[PDB]
Amino acid sequence: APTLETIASLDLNNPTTYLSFITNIRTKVADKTEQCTIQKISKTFTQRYSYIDLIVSSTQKITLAIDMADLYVLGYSDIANNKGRAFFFKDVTEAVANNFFPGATGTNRIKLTFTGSYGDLEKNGGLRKDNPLGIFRLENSIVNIYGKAGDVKKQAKFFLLAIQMVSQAAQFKYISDKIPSEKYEEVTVDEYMTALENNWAKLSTAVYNSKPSTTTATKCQLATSPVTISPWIFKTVEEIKLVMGLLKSSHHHHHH
Amino acid sequence: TLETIASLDLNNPTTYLSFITNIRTKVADKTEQCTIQKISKTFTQRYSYIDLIVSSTQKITLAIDMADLYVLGYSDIANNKGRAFFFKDVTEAVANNFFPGATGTNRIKLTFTGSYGDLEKNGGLRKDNPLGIFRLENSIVNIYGKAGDVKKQAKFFLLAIQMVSQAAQFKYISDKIPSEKYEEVTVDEYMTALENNWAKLSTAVYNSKPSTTTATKCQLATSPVTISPWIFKTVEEIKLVMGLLKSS
Amino acid sequence: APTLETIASLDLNNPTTYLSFITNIRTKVADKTEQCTIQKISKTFTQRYSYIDLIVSSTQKITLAIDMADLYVLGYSDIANNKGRAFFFKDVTEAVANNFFPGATGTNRIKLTFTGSYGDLEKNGGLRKDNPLGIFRLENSIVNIYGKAGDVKKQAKFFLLAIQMVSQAAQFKYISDKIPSEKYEEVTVDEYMTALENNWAKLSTAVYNSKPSTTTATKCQLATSPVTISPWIFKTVEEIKLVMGLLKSS
Amino acid sequence: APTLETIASLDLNNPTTYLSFITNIRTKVADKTEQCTIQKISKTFTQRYSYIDLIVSSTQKITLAIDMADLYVLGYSDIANNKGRAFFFKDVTEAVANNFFPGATGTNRIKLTFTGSYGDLEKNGGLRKDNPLGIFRLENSIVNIYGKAGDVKKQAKFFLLAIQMVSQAAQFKYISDKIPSEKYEEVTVDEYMTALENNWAKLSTAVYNSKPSTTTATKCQLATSPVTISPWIFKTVEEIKLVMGLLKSS
């Protein structure tokens, strides 16, 4: 089992640290060079897989399995009856999953019957608009599965919170910046939020395809304006920067 | 003649962070303190307008002092004539810079100031006046062209100052205004702690010391800086909540 | 349908009567004998089924169909096209529903397409956090459906206000005592309240499992401490007593 | 100074404990015998003066000087410059103040520049409606004055929250039952709350002057109906019982 780094940990009883935690994630995976003054995920990593911890107390945390290449959540790990236990998304290959959680062995390595797509998560845990985000919301979703028998509905509700408040919060300033430091306050996930969440690659490509502008703030101008991802109408790269925390990386192998 | 530095189409709520960003871009110095934007120390013209647009035929214009983002008054239309209201404590020399379309007897001095003590006393506690795009629009509809009603004017000012000025001062506030027009957000003790402590939080950054190991390259002169319930142990933590430092 | 008792009526234009109305519910359904000095719903009724009225005016009210055994809301009755009309949640048996509303006859007894679980009510009417409680909020939601054609969103919003401000309020003093005495003021349903609403059985069971004690005001002590219903962390039965209006019956 | 009991202590970081704290005060001061099934402050005490602690942390608390005869708050103690420091309301005589805080001596025994009347507190600290109640609000108000140089605004703002959320919270279920155990949530002190706060003796007198009843739940009926404490219109003693945690002694 390779040595994996824990690149960020969220102490859910310290809610004001949330943007510091998100910032750590952006800092760990981002390139040194920006793209139109927007951070972008690095194309390569020495070790692309890593952990992110979500802490409920000194003896209870869930550990996310992460692919830093795209900030995908691949599964998570808890502890049950003193044994380490790992749950992996259905579509995650054995070779990838084998990188994670050396304390989960044998029957405690569990392939879930669903993937991390929002289609699958909402099928099992309800529509995104019915799972509000928030610090305690995330904490409570952890309490409801930690050390417990596997429940797809509650696993899905946890995954909805964790993917949106960790992975896509890092990807989108628009998401991370809505989470209140008032631990018990919640944000409804509306169509403006889902629109961004479902169009991460489309927006990143629009930054990559933009042209250099000697007059504009981001020093870039869209190749084609507007970029419509309804209900958003993006007329400038600046307006894209206001929602983006990280661009998806570009390998420059194909044409856009 | 004064510039209109930003305008908010209350019916196109996605544009709100562009509108806040236009305010910050207009008033900020070219350079940052500890990598945080700060208000510019001087201005060719320190007074400007900010429009709050309800429709093609209806808007309220705020009078803004850009040196500190204070709202000094607003202007509407009543009986087909331009009209301006100014807070009690605004000098007539300052108020005179604003609204050439408001002449005659239609320039009015309000009986209260723009302080939260005054506004909350007349319009209700900040926790009882939730923020939101529609809430702001509706409060404008509730006073536009109407006889002066101190309570409804105070509710407008509570919404406008927080959703314009302090929204520009604090990313924490501006970034929680939902793009869903009819969604609102409560002004909780984390918001008011920031709102009450803009100068204190700016002073901590201006008094910080160089650091070679932190991302902002600053460290607090003494830690923590407490604006409860916030406990600020680093300048990066302050930076995450700030949109504009108070000008040195 | 037999003639059922109407055990309480809330005059929605006299908002300071609210806790008298909730007390009237508690008094009707509570057993004579308390558990750890907390009221509990009687195990037996001669007639478990009864009415609770929500009154908008002298001529406009909604009548809730109530199972007093668990304070379940099963449906409601209004008037539409000058005829008594009733709605019943999807999962309510015909035998149970036929106990209610003798003036809602003919074809005016309607099966709803959703149940009263919070999952069903919130997918149709929105999250508890987006449906604040309040006298006017309740009254308004009644006006938005009374005598109207079926509208699942508005009906579900009415049920959220009704179940939380009648049933759940009677069960939890913590909830009932937060309803504002001003008609037009409202209170957000936060995660403390929703934790209670989701865990009435678990909390009541924790009281039932408690051990006798001579030194505590409730004369009870927790079998295991704490009882955690996040965000609530209960270390005494006294702390549970002070949130509980009515224990689930044993 | 005599050695006085600390009859209750609120750990402001365990907000769920709040109603238990209030209950401890009521139990301590309440007579064995009730009046119209309302608790009444005992006519006498062997030692009427006592302490209540308001804990912000293991190292920082403020102790209230309390007169249990009437739940008057007479002052508070903190620590400044490594020494006990006492503050007493301006109208409290030396004889009374001498009962409290033996660890504060010399010039560390300080006469406040105002009394505990709401008129004095509002002059110095703002209207009650502009000073919302709340667990963290109270904690924040303590932090803002503990060990600090005198500040009449923050001292007054502390007393507004302390008197309302301790003394009058025990006097009035209406106040105590509104405080959320979500510690950041606040309650607006509107006309319904100030009306109760201003009329504690009048409401208590209305209870003592009440007549017997064989039917009502309290076994009392008002001597004259209604008892109006605007905006409240009390037609029954059951309605008064809903809002009151303690009667003033007669």
Numbering used by the authors:
A (entry chain B): 1 to 256
B (entry chain A): 3 to 250
C (entry chain C), D (entry chain D): 1 to 250
Sentences from the paper on this structure:
Mirabilis antiviral protein (MAP) is the type I ribosome-inactivating protein (RIP), which consists of an RNA N-glycosylase domain with no carbohydrate-binding domain. Ribosome-inactivating proteins (RIPs) are a diverse family of toxic enzymes that catalyze the removal of the specific adenine residues from ribosomal RNA (rRNA N-glycosylase EC 3.2.2.22), thereby irreversibly inhibiting protein synthesis and leading to cell death. Unlike many RIPs, such as ricin or trichosanthin, which inactivate eukaryotic ribosomes, MAP also inactivates the E. coli ribosome by cleaving the N-glycosidic bond at A2660 of 23S ribosomal RNA. Mirabilis antiviral protein (MAP) was identified in the roots of Mirabilis jalapa as a potent antiviral agent against the transmission of tobacco mosaic virus.
Because of the MAP effect on the E. coli ribosomes, wild-type MAP (wt-MAP) was difficult to produce by the E. coli system. It has been shown that RTA residues E177 and R180 play a crucial role in the hydrolysis of N-glycoside bonds by stabilizing the transition state during the catalysis of the depurination reaction. As these two residues were conserved in MAP, the inactivated recombinant MAP-EQRQ was expressed, purified, and crystallized. Here, we expressed, purified, and crystallized the plural recombinant MAPs, including both E168Q and R171Q mutations (MAP-EQRQ) in E. coli, and determined the crystal structure of MAP-EQRQ at 2.1 Å resolution. As a result, there were four molecules of MAPs in the asymmetric unit, which belong to the C2 space group. There are four molecules (A, B, C, and D) in the asymmetric unit, which are formed by a dimer of dimers. The 2-fold symmetric dimer was formed by residues α7 (Y174, D177, and K178), α10 (E238 and K241), and α1 (L19) in the α7α8-loop (E182 and E185). Notably, the active site comprises the conserved amino acid residues in these RIPs, including Y72, Y118, E168, and R171 of MAP. According to the assay, approximately 98% of E. coli ribosomes (0.2 µM) were depurinated by wt-MAP at 0.050 µM, and approximately 90% by the single mutant E168Q at 5 μM, whereas the double mutant MAP-EQRQ, as well as the single R171Q mutant, showed no inhibitory activity even at 5 µM. We impose the MAP structure with TCS/RTA with the eukaryotic stalk to see if there is any difference in these stalk-binding regions; in the stalk-binding region, crystal structures of MAP showed that the peptide binding region is hydrophobic and formed by Y174, Y192, W232, F234, and V243. Among MAP and TCS/RTA, the structures of these sites differ broadly, such that MAP lacks the stalk-binding hydrophobic deep pocket, as seen in RTA.
